[PDB]
RNA sequence: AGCCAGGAUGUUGGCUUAGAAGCAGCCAUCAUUUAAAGAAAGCGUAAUAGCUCACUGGUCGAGUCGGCCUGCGCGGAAGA
């Protein structure tokens, strides 16, 4: 969004033509892409000043500037439409004229992310440090939490189909999944696994209950995506390295016995292009 | 000939100044004069202009055959005008008119703003469409073709500056 | 403009006009069919 | 009827619902819902035993409209429907196999006489004799 | 020679039909109407939709066109 030909209103209104979705954007644009200084958040109706030097400094919020006093007018009225047709209860105060505050509208739109009919769009620059400090506050209010979602849903081991919503807190049997299982010349196999709920201690007979194998839980290590930091006590929701698995496949469980059990491998791919390596 | 069977009818609203070889046409919005060659015999006879090739210059059927086509365009150019629209197809390329100056967003490290001479009232409805208006048929092309020569039609994408009625022939990569 | 001693009217719509004295042959869509000498 | 916009007569055996895209660009000319030309003709296609190419023409109109003319199958494929094989023209004047007299040719011309104003009876008779000689077929009465 | 201008329409033109559907190529090489149309020239192209040649069917309303022979001319023609 600091480039030529970068029209914000075109692309979000191009999704309604090609992708066929319903995007209603929120953070609009101020500046002719080279003297660009403001990103127009429309709920609080505030433009944000960014850095000039000293690569990250300011977050200065001001009002809507005078050069865009009418485009903020005709686009805020479509924002406050987006709760009257999200929940049925905001239908009668769009027309009655109860005030549509910043805090009231998000309580409907957050429930519009569990069905995913609208996506929330934001223009800005990553590299020019214009928008990155803005983009974080929507994540806690428009992206869902592991305790706000439907949690771990184990079904059974065999038989009928009883899908069971388990708890997202620490008060459940342990559960995780195995993915991004990288390698290393130190210990051999590594993982980038994420635990959904429950707490594990250090040292466990973690099995892989889909393929009938016994494994033991070694010294777990966390990263800054690069550096070895030994995570001993893994809390519910961290992402770490389930180390020392003897055999492990794509997406099987990491679970103590006498507990719920998953058995799920969906969309196993097909590597297509085949070249023959020779020594 | 066909040109000898082609006389031109001047209408009311455009005045001729026949000082023999030098004709200065007093028109609607300008003064479209051409100082022709001496291979012509000019006469605004009654209303419809009649011409003639001079003796010795018997190749003046060509040299006044230019002239018969010439002055017809001049009396209709000073009054009505030429719409000469150009189509800017360039990634991040814009066009905007101010006074008599055109910007050229042309993918360079520096802007190109060239001033355009008299006989031009330029306009720009958008960043990709640009009007040019003028009275001479020569000047309505000469200022247009200079822009097009700065970025010729690229026959691998369709990139470039191109006329409204001009249709390029874009090819395909075919190797990689 | 390719040069060769022979200007042969090759493409189906090939104009020929004598610009400056040296003949160069004018196609429409084919740039490959344009010679200049002879 | 109409003029330089569009006029092509192309349809093949109507047992195939899909528009068969050596025909498809004749349906890919002026913006049709291809389901409409599938739903127009099938009300009368259940009065036939399929297997022969039946022809229709396309003709167009301003906004999104179109039209089409139904006729009977031509006698050229009716020559090679009775003869068993659909393609006999390997050598025209060197093959002498297969006879049908004029009586078959006129009764497949009454269905032309009850459908179309050209392709008349007596004039086509030499060309239904002319499509016989190119295929290498004989005729006697 | 240009602007209107139908490209009158039997047909899918086979083969071998996977498309070789007038437009890859070998044998036929008729024409229902002949005041305008060939079982056919390229481009669009796997095939075709798009655009023409075909007759210019209606307008301009006069000359015009392709080759044979010679008088001379241009290119071909770059050196220390």
XYZ file of C-alpha atoms (C1' of nucleotides) in Angstrom:
714
model
C 0.000 0.000 0.000
C 3.001 2.257 -0.610
C 3.104 1.328 -4.292
C 1.710 2.603 -7.558
C -1.614 1.185 -8.689
C -2.485 0.212 -5.101
C -6.162 1.121 -4.807
C -7.545 -0.139 -1.490
C -11.213 0.256 -2.397
C -10.745 -1.589 -5.689
C -9.355 -4.829 -4.245
C -11.868 -5.229 -1.411
C -14.612 -4.524 -3.941
C -12.953 -7.005 -6.315
C -13.614 -9.864 -3.889
C -17.361 -9.368 -4.413
C -16.758 -10.039 -8.133
C -14.173 -12.828 -8.304
C -14.198 -14.526 -4.907
C -17.919 -13.789 -4.516
C -17.601 -13.099 -0.792
C -18.967 -10.228 1.338
C -16.116 -8.056 2.652
C -16.960 -4.892 4.596
C -13.618 -3.156 5.274
C -12.807 -1.028 8.291
C -9.375 0.634 8.174
C -9.340 2.906 5.119
C -6.643 5.013 3.468
C -5.250 8.551 3.778
C -2.499 9.740 1.459
C -1.623 9.518 -2.239
C 0.576 6.449 -1.607
C 3.872 8.352 -1.297
C 2.966 11.022 1.247
C 0.869 8.345 2.961
C 0.537 9.029 6.690
C -2.897 7.898 7.938
C -4.870 4.665 8.087
C -8.551 5.379 8.595
C -9.964 3.236 11.380
C -13.683 3.766 11.043
C -15.149 2.374 14.284
C -13.363 4.926 16.491
C -13.126 7.342 13.491
C -9.464 8.056 14.205
C -6.443 8.403 11.927
C -3.062 7.212 13.184
C 0.225 9.048 12.700
C 3.261 6.863 12.023
C 7.017 7.212 12.189
C 9.114 9.718 10.248
C 12.485 8.478 11.477
C 13.577 6.288 14.415
C 12.023 3.278 12.760
C 9.232 2.712 15.248
C 8.100 5.595 17.484
C 4.627 7.111 17.354
C 0.998 5.974 17.522
C -0.549 9.437 17.492
C -4.319 9.257 17.061
C -6.175 12.293 15.734
C -9.546 12.939 14.130
C -10.552 12.279 10.523
C -8.632 14.770 8.347
C -10.482 17.407 6.375
C -9.403 16.048 2.992
C -11.552 12.930 3.499
C -14.525 14.206 5.523
C -17.174 12.823 3.152
C -15.686 9.445 2.195
C -15.567 8.707 5.917
C -19.252 9.690 5.987
C -20.448 7.377 3.212
C -18.341 4.442 4.403
C -19.133 4.577 8.124
C -22.827 4.197 7.300
C -22.022 0.849 5.647
C -20.006 -0.246 8.688
C -22.982 0.265 10.974
C -25.147 -1.612 8.485
C -22.964 -4.671 9.155
C -24.533 -5.435 12.572
C -28.215 -5.025 11.652
C -27.870 -7.967 9.224
C -25.451 -9.874 11.504
C -27.740 -10.110 14.536
C -31.493 -9.584 14.299
C -31.466 -7.332 17.374
C -29.443 -4.533 15.755
C -32.012 -4.377 12.938
C -34.382 -2.097 14.847
C -31.754 0.335 16.103
C -30.181 0.982 12.708
C -33.557 2.481 11.764
C -34.652 3.724 15.188
C -31.419 5.594 15.703
C -29.886 4.236 18.878
C -26.195 5.140 18.851
C -23.898 2.601 17.173
C -20.802 2.882 19.328
C -17.376 1.351 18.855
C -17.918 -1.222 21.595
C -21.471 -2.277 20.730
C -20.935 -3.192 17.072
C -18.045 -5.602 17.664
C -20.163 -7.766 19.971
C -22.253 -8.725 16.973
C -19.399 -8.901 14.450
C -17.240 -11.212 16.579
C -20.054 -13.744 16.320
C -19.844 -13.114 12.568
C -16.411 -14.780 12.594
C -17.669 -18.154 13.897
C -19.677 -18.578 10.671
C -17.269 -16.580 8.422
C -19.419 -14.639 5.993
C -17.390 -11.394 6.271
C -13.620 -10.932 6.496
C -11.999 -7.879 8.076
C -9.578 -5.953 5.853
C -6.828 -3.431 6.681
C -4.549 -1.390 4.427
C -1.028 -0.389 5.372
C 2.668 -1.077 4.991
C 4.694 -3.755 6.694
C 8.079 -2.507 5.544
C 7.426 1.228 5.943
C 6.211 0.590 9.550
C 2.737 1.898 8.673
C -0.050 -0.326 9.973
C 1.771 -3.069 11.889
C 1.155 -1.434 15.257
C -2.407 -0.845 14.079
C -3.018 -4.439 12.999
C -2.598 -6.059 16.420
C -5.711 -4.767 18.196
C -8.081 -6.458 15.743
C -6.533 -9.868 16.448
C -7.812 -9.849 20.024
C -11.260 -8.773 18.790
C -11.787 -10.343 15.340
C -9.614 -13.504 15.394
C -10.839 -16.313 17.669
C -9.159 -17.612 20.865
C -8.660 -21.315 21.707
C -11.134 -20.964 24.609
C -13.750 -19.058 22.579
C -13.849 -21.667 19.785
C -15.282 -25.167 19.869
C -12.373 -26.932 21.564
C -10.892 -30.428 21.213
C -13.637 -32.759 19.996
C -12.591 -36.350 20.406
C -15.181 -38.842 19.276
C -14.251 -42.377 20.408
C -11.753 -45.130 19.593
C -14.174 -47.449 17.747
C -17.888 -47.978 17.209
C -20.610 -45.355 16.809
C -20.288 -41.564 16.399
C -20.519 -39.469 19.592
C -18.580 -36.227 18.981
C -17.690 -34.860 22.424
C -16.780 -31.201 22.974
C -14.073 -31.336 25.587
C -12.952 -28.450 27.800
C -10.543 -25.737 26.682
C -9.213 -25.286 30.228
C -6.630 -27.179 32.276
C -9.355 -29.445 33.747
C -9.369 -32.090 30.981
C -7.359 -35.118 29.926
C -4.335 -34.012 27.926
C -4.526 -33.623 24.145
C -2.329 -32.370 21.306
C -1.573 -32.982 17.638
C 1.581 -33.737 15.662
C 2.535 -31.548 12.696
C 5.508 -29.674 11.188
C 7.772 -32.469 12.292
C 11.223 -31.177 11.361
C 14.647 -32.773 11.792
C 18.013 -31.941 13.322
C 21.495 -33.489 13.614
C 21.337 -33.173 17.427
C 18.417 -35.376 18.550
C 17.169 -36.585 15.169
C 13.448 -35.960 14.903
C 11.834 -32.734 16.092
C 8.284 -31.397 16.053
C 6.483 -28.056 15.932
C 3.403 -29.211 17.854
C 0.659 -27.163 19.497
C -1.280 -28.229 22.589
C -4.936 -27.212 22.625
C -5.771 -27.711 26.310
C -4.456 -29.492 29.384
C -1.028 -29.376 31.013
C 1.797 -31.899 30.668
C 4.725 -32.323 33.007
C 8.267 -33.166 31.893
C 8.658 -36.868 31.153
C 5.584 -38.778 30.029
C 4.504 -41.942 28.241
C 2.940 -39.992 25.395
C 1.648 -42.463 22.832
C 0.410 -42.059 19.263
C -2.911 -43.815 19.667
C -3.809 -44.065 15.963
C -0.938 -46.373 14.964
C -0.354 -48.413 18.191
C 3.148 -47.345 19.236
C 4.783 -46.448 22.547
C 6.911 -43.320 22.946
C 8.400 -41.407 25.890
C 8.410 -37.625 26.316
C 11.918 -36.150 26.433
C 13.311 -32.631 26.892
C 10.916 -30.212 25.189
C 12.439 -27.106 23.577
C 10.823 -23.817 22.485
C 12.165 -21.353 19.920
C 12.212 -17.781 18.726
C 11.654 -19.743 15.462
C 15.445 -20.362 15.576
C 17.062 -20.641 19.024
C 16.956 -23.573 21.448
C 15.066 -22.658 24.626
C 14.179 -25.663 26.775
C 10.476 -25.507 27.700
C 9.987 -27.798 30.679
C 6.398 -27.187 31.751
C 4.129 -26.911 28.701
C 0.971 -24.952 29.464
C -2.329 -25.249 27.614
C -1.869 -23.362 24.363
C 1.881 -23.142 23.869
C 3.685 -24.338 20.734
C 6.831 -26.383 21.275
C 8.776 -29.479 20.201
C 7.341 -32.847 21.255
C 10.782 -34.403 21.203
C 11.856 -38.038 21.203
C 8.933 -39.634 19.346
C 10.018 -43.062 18.101
C 7.532 -43.104 15.238
C 5.074 -40.308 14.433
C 2.809 -39.662 11.451
C 0.859 -36.734 10.055
C -1.686 -35.481 12.572
C -2.044 -38.270 15.112
C -2.718 -37.742 18.778
C -0.258 -36.916 21.549
C -2.257 -38.241 24.471
C -2.007 -40.130 27.749
C -4.002 -43.382 27.895
C -7.361 -43.711 29.680
C -8.403 -40.507 27.909
C -10.296 -39.346 24.790
C -8.686 -40.342 21.508
C -8.619 -38.848 18.005
C -8.244 -40.825 14.757
C -8.187 -38.315 11.929
C -6.134 -37.958 8.757
C -7.953 -35.985 6.059
C -6.599 -34.947 2.629
C -3.417 -36.938 2.258
C -1.777 -35.235 -0.752
C -0.068 -36.569 -3.872
C 3.403 -35.279 -4.767
C 3.141 -35.295 -8.568
C 6.424 -34.422 -10.312
C 8.899 -37.297 -10.145
C 12.631 -36.871 -10.768
C 15.207 -39.645 -10.267
C 18.272 -38.775 -8.190
C 21.523 -40.627 -8.938
C 24.688 -40.787 -6.789
C -8.865 13.276 -62.157
C -10.531 12.306 -58.901
C -8.947 15.345 -57.285
C -10.019 17.493 -60.249
C -13.522 16.088 -59.665
C -13.190 17.201 -56.015
C -13.884 20.860 -55.265
C -14.254 22.049 -51.687
C -17.199 24.114 -50.413
C -16.267 26.753 -47.839
C -19.210 27.538 -45.531
C -20.139 30.721 -43.716
C -18.025 31.242 -40.615
C -14.539 30.850 -42.116
C -12.975 33.723 -44.085
C -10.208 33.360 -46.667
C -7.490 35.965 -47.333
C -6.373 35.340 -50.913
C -3.100 37.202 -51.372
C -2.297 34.819 -54.205
C 0.208 32.206 -53.038
C -0.313 33.033 -49.349
C -3.745 32.152 -47.986
C -4.513 32.847 -44.337
C -7.867 31.353 -43.331
C -9.700 33.376 -40.676
C -11.800 30.741 -38.965
C -13.746 29.998 -35.799
C -11.102 29.455 -33.116
C -7.798 29.923 -34.948
C -5.917 30.908 -38.104
C -5.144 27.901 -40.311
C -2.784 29.213 -42.990
C -0.676 27.289 -45.473
C 1.865 28.937 -47.746
C 1.561 26.497 -50.630
C 3.904 25.884 -53.535
C 3.722 27.699 -56.882
C 2.206 24.651 -58.574
C -1.324 25.844 -57.789
C -3.927 28.206 -59.289
C -6.331 29.097 -56.476
C -9.741 30.754 -56.830
C -12.618 30.947 -54.358
C -14.962 31.073 -57.336
C -18.460 31.616 -55.969
C -18.653 29.696 -52.695
C -17.145 26.320 -53.629
C -13.399 26.655 -54.008
C -11.856 25.709 -57.345
C -8.155 25.086 -57.951
C -5.755 24.448 -60.807
C -2.310 23.095 -61.687
C 0.074 25.699 -63.089
C 1.895 25.110 -66.370
C 5.503 23.950 -66.235
C 4.739 22.218 -62.941
C 2.574 19.569 -64.569
C 3.406 17.432 -61.515
C 1.374 20.049 -59.621
C -1.632 17.756 -59.938
C 0.155 16.070 -57.065
C 1.273 19.338 -55.472
C -2.228 20.799 -55.539
C -3.772 17.379 -54.977
C -2.289 17.792 -51.534
C -3.891 21.240 -51.385
C -7.419 20.103 -52.284
C -7.299 17.644 -49.407
C -5.544 20.236 -47.253
C -7.896 23.207 -47.119
C -10.963 20.970 -46.771
C -9.520 19.762 -43.482
C -8.616 23.294 -42.409
C -12.101 24.771 -42.654
C -13.551 21.831 -40.731
C -10.744 21.719 -38.172
C -10.841 25.329 -36.987
C -14.564 25.015 -36.222
C -15.430 21.473 -35.154
C -12.131 19.974 -34.038
C -10.420 16.629 -33.517
C -10.963 14.283 -30.600
C -7.625 12.488 -30.306
C -7.859 10.127 -27.339
C -4.981 7.945 -26.179
C -5.153 4.798 -24.072
C -2.578 4.465 -21.283
C -2.088 0.794 -20.421
C 0.800 0.781 -17.944
C 1.284 -0.707 -14.467
C 0.892 2.303 -12.220
C 0.599 4.784 -15.073
C -1.495 7.921 -14.762
C -2.456 10.984 -16.785
C -3.613 14.355 -15.465
C -4.010 17.729 -17.162
C -3.080 21.087 -15.649
C -3.043 24.236 -17.761
C -1.311 23.096 -20.933
C 0.974 20.540 -19.259
C 0.661 16.746 -19.204
C 2.254 14.505 -16.597
C 3.878 11.256 -17.687
C 3.854 8.500 -15.072
C 6.225 6.450 -17.223
C 8.094 4.056 -14.937
C 11.170 6.242 -14.568
C 13.269 7.433 -11.660
C 12.143 11.001 -12.412
C 8.888 12.665 -13.563
C 8.416 13.834 -17.157
C 6.255 16.952 -17.507
C 6.405 18.439 -21.007
C 4.637 21.674 -21.947
C 2.425 21.512 -24.997
C 2.193 24.264 -27.650
C -0.627 26.426 -28.959
C -3.436 24.788 -30.851
C -3.841 22.348 -27.953
C -6.550 22.232 -25.276
C -5.765 18.938 -23.550
C -8.010 17.066 -21.108
C -7.935 13.890 -19.012
C -11.142 12.145 -17.883
C -9.089 9.563 -16.003
C -5.550 8.327 -15.431
C -5.645 6.151 -18.561
C -7.672 8.295 -20.991
C -6.448 11.661 -22.280
C -8.152 14.054 -24.630
C -6.325 16.242 -27.105
C -8.156 19.012 -28.968
C -6.824 21.035 -31.893
C -7.415 22.801 -35.188
C -4.680 21.617 -37.582
C -4.681 17.964 -38.547
C -0.882 17.937 -38.314
C -0.673 19.361 -34.792
C -3.338 17.008 -33.497
C -1.082 14.101 -34.408
C 2.423 15.485 -33.831
C 1.927 16.142 -30.133
C 0.131 12.796 -29.834
C 2.779 10.684 -31.539
C 5.564 12.059 -29.365
C 3.990 10.583 -26.231
C 3.390 7.251 -27.959
C 7.035 7.161 -29.056
C 8.153 7.406 -25.430
C 6.524 4.063 -24.675
C 5.710 2.113 -27.826
C 3.143 -0.740 -27.745
C 4.917 -3.733 -26.248
C 4.010 -6.896 -28.163
C 4.450 -9.363 -25.324
C 1.984 -7.949 -22.815
C 0.133 -5.189 -24.584
C 2.059 -2.663 -22.476
C 2.609 0.859 -23.721
C 0.845 4.024 -24.720
C -1.506 3.536 -27.652
C -4.218 5.390 -29.536
C -7.967 5.045 -29.043
C -8.599 3.371 -32.417
C -5.226 1.608 -32.686
C -5.216 -2.156 -32.136
C -1.870 -3.761 -31.275
C -0.729 -7.278 -32.094
C 0.436 -8.876 -28.860
C 2.304 -12.179 -29.067
C 2.944 -15.051 -26.652
C 6.138 -16.080 -24.824
C 6.214 -19.672 -26.195
C 9.559 -20.660 -24.599
C 9.443 -19.816 -20.879
C 15.025 -3.517 -41.385
C 16.737 -6.491 -42.939
C 18.877 -5.704 -45.976
C 19.298 -7.842 -49.098
C 19.608 -7.142 -52.800
C 16.209 -8.630 -53.637
C 12.960 -6.958 -52.748
C 10.427 -9.652 -53.577
C 6.787 -8.911 -52.796
C 6.344 -11.666 -50.269
C 3.499 -11.119 -47.784
C -0.049 -11.032 -49.165
C -0.584 -7.390 -48.206
C 2.830 -5.916 -48.935
C 3.012 -2.222 -49.798
C 5.907 -0.912 -51.872
C 6.835 2.785 -51.814
C 10.158 4.414 -52.670
C 11.211 6.328 -49.579
C 14.483 8.276 -50.209
C 15.167 6.127 -53.309
C 15.980 2.875 -51.566
C 12.969 0.583 -51.649
C 11.598 -0.677 -48.358
C 8.520 -2.910 -48.427
C 5.611 -2.323 -46.033
C 3.567 -5.183 -44.567
C 0.860 -4.717 -41.971
C 1.099 -7.311 -39.232
C 4.404 -9.012 -40.104
C 7.557 -7.075 -39.242
C 9.546 -10.020 -40.609
C 8.526 -9.292 -44.191
C 10.303 -5.921 -44.517
C 13.489 -5.644 -46.608
C 15.524 -2.596 -47.620
C 17.936 -2.400 -50.576
C 17.666 -3.068 -54.281
C -34.017 -13.532 -42.122
C -31.251 -11.659 -40.324
C -27.936 -10.217 -41.460
C -24.187 -9.772 -40.738
C -24.555 -10.355 -36.949
C -24.933 -14.174 -36.942
C -26.227 -17.047 -39.106
C -24.724 -20.575 -38.846
C -26.600 -23.874 -39.233
C -24.874 -26.426 -37.002
C -26.391 -29.198 -34.913
C -25.432 -32.890 -34.775
C -27.316 -35.931 -33.291
C -29.509 -34.756 -30.416
C -28.924 -37.735 -28.137
C -25.960 -35.843 -26.666
C -27.176 -33.209 -24.209
C -23.777 -31.504 -24.013
C -23.240 -28.887 -26.753
C -20.261 -30.773 -28.405
C -17.745 -27.910 -28.673
C -17.020 -28.125 -32.346
C -20.639 -26.881 -32.196
C -20.209 -24.986 -28.876
C -18.782 -21.795 -30.422
C -21.959 -21.538 -32.491
C -23.530 -21.478 -29.019
C -20.541 -19.399 -27.874
C -21.359 -16.405 -30.078
C -24.006 -14.174 -28.471
C -24.202 -15.138 -24.780
C -26.605 -18.012 -24.268
C -27.485 -19.980 -21.204
C -26.511 -23.344 -22.712
C -29.167 -24.982 -20.528
C -31.830 -23.109 -22.532
C -30.931 -24.722 -25.856
C -30.872 -28.059 -24.028
C -34.376 -27.467 -22.654
C -35.873 -26.025 -25.856
C -35.491 -29.010 -28.175
C -35.959 -32.030 -25.883
C -39.755 -31.686 -25.839
C -39.755 -32.876 -29.462
C -36.605 -35.055 -29.367
C -38.665 -37.793 -27.664
C -40.428 -38.399 -30.984
C -37.317 -39.953 -32.603
C -34.925 -42.887 -32.425
C -31.621 -41.054 -32.086
C -28.534 -41.703 -34.198
C -28.679 -39.232 -37.076
C -27.342 -35.664 -37.059
C -30.407 -33.408 -36.946
C -29.705 -29.765 -37.939
C -30.774 -26.463 -36.391
C -29.747 -22.902 -37.261
C -29.003 -20.083 -34.806
C -30.192 -16.481 -35.260
C -29.795 -13.647 -32.785
C -31.444 -10.538 -31.308
C -30.371 -7.344 -29.498
C -30.316 -7.661 -25.707
C -29.695 -11.285 -24.633
C -32.181 -12.977 -26.927
C -31.739 -15.544 -29.691
C -33.858 -17.811 -31.881
C -33.593 -21.100 -33.782
C -35.372 -22.930 -36.622
C -36.254 -26.631 -36.477
C -36.110 -28.680 -39.678
C -35.830 -32.375 -40.544
C -32.543 -34.346 -40.922
C -30.952 -33.965 -44.362
C -31.018 -36.570 -47.099
C -27.204 -36.748 -47.177
C -27.135 -38.675 -43.897
C -30.343 -40.440 -44.946
C -28.388 -41.922 -47.856
C -25.908 -43.484 -45.422
C -28.423 -44.349 -42.692
C -30.138 -46.962 -44.880
C -26.851 -48.067 -46.502
C -25.536 -49.180 -43.090
C -22.163 -47.397 -43.031
C -21.942 -43.673 -42.335
C -18.859 -43.029 -44.540
C -18.573 -44.647 -47.963
C -16.703 -42.027 -49.984
C -13.269 -43.612 -50.365
C -13.152 -43.616 -54.165
C -16.105 -41.955 -55.954
C -15.874 -43.282 -59.519
C -14.263 -46.625 -58.697
C -16.738 -48.147 -56.229
C -20.023 -49.766 -57.400
C -21.829 -51.025 -54.249
C -25.337 -50.377 -52.957
C -28.628 -49.488 -54.661
C -31.625 -47.380 -53.631
C -34.187 -46.268 -56.210
C -35.883 -42.890 -56.583
C -38.949 -43.945 -54.557
C -36.961 -43.898 -51.310
C -35.515 -40.528 -52.324
C -38.879 -38.817 -52.778
C -40.355 -40.152 -49.529
C -37.382 -38.645 -47.721
C -38.164 -35.555 -49.799
C -41.807 -35.265 -48.742
C -40.448 -34.763 -45.227
C -38.412 -32.037 -46.889
C -41.550 -30.895 -48.728
C -43.436 -30.782 -45.440
C -40.583 -28.838 -43.749
C -38.701 -26.493 -46.097
C -39.336 -24.242 -49.106
C -36.004 -24.911 -50.795
C -34.461 -28.352 -51.291
C -37.297 -29.196 -53.665
C -38.192 -32.685 -54.907
C -37.142 -32.843 -58.551
C -34.118 -30.543 -58.300
C -32.466 -32.392 -55.395
C -33.043 -35.724 -57.200
C -29.835 -35.399 -59.202
C -27.950 -34.199 -56.104
C -29.293 -37.143 -54.147
C -27.944 -38.928 -57.197
C -24.865 -36.709 -56.864
C -24.164 -37.660 -53.265
C -24.414 -41.283 -54.418
C -21.677 -41.065 -57.078
C -19.194 -39.320 -54.775
C -19.692 -42.062 -52.173
C -19.336 -44.764 -54.825
C -22.952 -45.926 -54.857
C -25.218 -47.189 -57.649
C -28.824 -46.312 -58.505
C -31.417 -48.094 -60.649
C -35.213 -48.067 -60.782
C -10.901 2.520 -55.133
C -13.798 3.434 -50.368
C -18.895 3.944 -46.611
C -23.519 1.128 -46.262
C -22.950 -4.592 -47.712
C -25.472 -9.849 -47.565
C -20.812 -12.908 -46.714
C -27.974 -16.209 -50.167
C -27.483 -21.359 -47.531
C -28.080 -28.073 -48.675
C -23.195 -30.287 -45.006
C -21.307 -32.955 -40.179
C -18.234 -32.705 -46.613
C -16.125 -37.904 -45.649
C -12.212 -40.876 -44.650
C -9.714 -42.662 -39.680
C -14.464 -39.171 -37.290
C -10.213 -38.294 -30.921
C -10.894 -32.440 -33.741
C -8.371 -34.073 -38.445
C -16.479 -30.032 -38.598
C -14.995 -25.067 -45.981
C -9.578 -23.464 -42.759
C -3.963 -30.837 -41.585
C -3.873 -33.633 -45.917
C -5.373 -37.219 -50.290
C -9.885 -38.846 -53.953
C -14.564 -36.500 -55.712
C -14.665 -31.466 -57.286
C -22.929 -31.834 -57.389
C -24.963 -27.933 -56.322
C -31.364 -27.324 -54.112
C -31.743 -20.241 -55.848
C -28.465 -18.852 -59.683
C -29.812 -9.884 -59.975
C -24.943 -11.978 -54.739
C -21.960 -17.177 -53.055
C -16.921 -21.826 -53.837
C -18.288 -29.021 -51.378
C -13.275 -22.815 -50.700
C -7.161 -18.496 -49.761
C -5.016 -16.787 -45.042
C -5.546 -15.100 -40.347
C -8.902 -16.539 -35.194
C -7.327 -21.887 -34.147
C -7.570 -28.642 -30.857
C -12.430 -27.060 -33.404
C -14.844 -23.009 -34.269
C -17.121 -17.783 -32.472
C -14.122 -12.879 -34.797
C -12.241 -10.678 -39.862
C -12.365 -11.181 -45.501
C -11.681 -13.041 -50.776
C -15.455 -14.446 -53.500
C -20.452 -11.011 -57.059
C -19.481 -5.537 -55.303
C -26.592 -6.698 -54.785
C -27.181 -0.864 -53.768
C -24.088 4.454 -54.146
C -20.038 7.626 -56.900
C -20.917 8.601 -62.043
C -15.714 8.708 -65.310
C -11.866 6.143 -67.421
C -9.328 2.159 -65.667
C -6.216 -2.554 -65.453
C -2.372 -6.688 -65.901
C 1.492 -8.163 -68.699
C 5.147 -8.116 -73.885
C 9.007 -4.845 -76.513
C 12.458 -0.794 -76.458
C 14.816 5.037 -74.620
C 17.070 6.100 -70.815
C 17.331 6.363 -64.929
C 17.666 4.113 -58.964
C 19.258 0.414 -55.863
C 23.423 -3.523 -56.115
C 28.401 0.214 -55.248
C 32.943 -0.973 -48.965
C 39.397 0.690 -48.339
C 43.497 2.290 -46.920
